[PDB]
Amino acid sequence: ASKGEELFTGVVPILVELDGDVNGHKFSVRGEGEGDATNGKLTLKFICTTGKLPVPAPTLVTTLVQCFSRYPDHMKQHDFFKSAMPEGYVQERTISFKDDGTYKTRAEVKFEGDTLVNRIELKGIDFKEDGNILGHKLEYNFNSHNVYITADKQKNGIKANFKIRHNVEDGSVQLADHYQQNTPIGDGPVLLPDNHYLSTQSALSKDPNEKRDHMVLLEFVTAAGITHG
């Protein structure tokens, strides 16, 4: 276990800020909500603050705070994300949409006072104008996935790999391969984990009273994959 884990024993407010540029289309997103790591639960509402999104909101879910995962007691020595708090971590990804473009993301996740804040820059290139992303052909929903984590000792952090399945309006699936690395911002002690995964489930909905382009998100995340003694 870690001292950072103590910052998560109750409900913690969350702020998310994203600046994005996909094929030259610039946009920003702000999210607000709260997380309950004891139960692996978070609730967030995101608004596009610059107009409407040039990509489907579901493609931004993974970019828009894995410190809120529930780690079972026998796995708490493997929770890198909380161990890096409060100073936080840098989270970087390459997201490769099969037969389409790529997102590159860099985020800082840290406590700013009492609030857990995720600040992101996202750049997307090579998207097809007639593809599922710029063509807005993805359904407004989200599947359950496993996020596979391994230690990166040389960088004092972790890597992760997973493949998101985005349902397409024609009944097919658009795959989005995720490659992830996380490294501490501060220089306090961290936990470098044995291999394990996060089992993630998400539900998207709408605020009926919200006129701006937006997304309401509920997520449950639980660590797994290390057998209890």
From Swiss-Prot:
A Pfam family per the record: GFP
Alphabetical keyword list: Chromophore, Luminescence, Photoprotein
Biological process (GO), any one: bioluminescence
Outcome when changing residue 145 to D: In Cerulean; leads to improved quantum yield, a higher extinction coefficient and is 2.5-fold brighter than ECFP
Result of altering residue 66 to M: In Citrinine; leads to excitation and emission peaks of 516 and 529 nm, respectively
Outcome recorded upon mutating residue 200 to H/W/F: Results in significantly red-shifted excitation and emission maxima
Biotech uses: Green fluorescent protein has been engineered to produce a vast number of variously colored mutants, fusion proteins, and biosensors. Further generation of mutants led to more stable proteins (at 37 degrees Celsius for example) with brighter fluorescence and longer fluorescence lifetimes.
PTM (free text): Contains a chromophore consisting of modified amino acid residues. Maturation of the chromophore requires nothing other than molecular oxygen.
UniProt-reported outcome of changing residue 200 to Y: Gives rise to yellow-emission variants. In EYFP; leads to yellow fluorescence, folds faster and more efficiently at 37 degrees Celsius and has superior solubility and brightness
Impact upon substituting residue 65 to L: In EYFP; leads to yellow fluorescence, folds faster and more efficiently at 37 degrees Celsius and has superior solubility and brightness
Consequence of substituting residue 77 to R: In Azurite; shifts the excitation and emission spectra to shorter wavelengths and increases quantum yields compared to BFP
Stated consequence of mutating residue 159 to Q: In R10-3; matures to the red-emitting state with excitation and emission maxima at 555 and 585 nm, respectively
Its biological purpose: Energy-transfer acceptor. Its role is to transduce the blue chemiluminescence of the protein aequorin into green fluorescent light by energy transfer. Fluoresces in vivo upon receiving energy from the Ca(2+)-activated photoprotein aequorin.
Family per similarity comment: Belongs to the GFP family.
Protein name from the UniProt record: Green fluorescent protein
Annotated organism of origin: Aequorea victoria
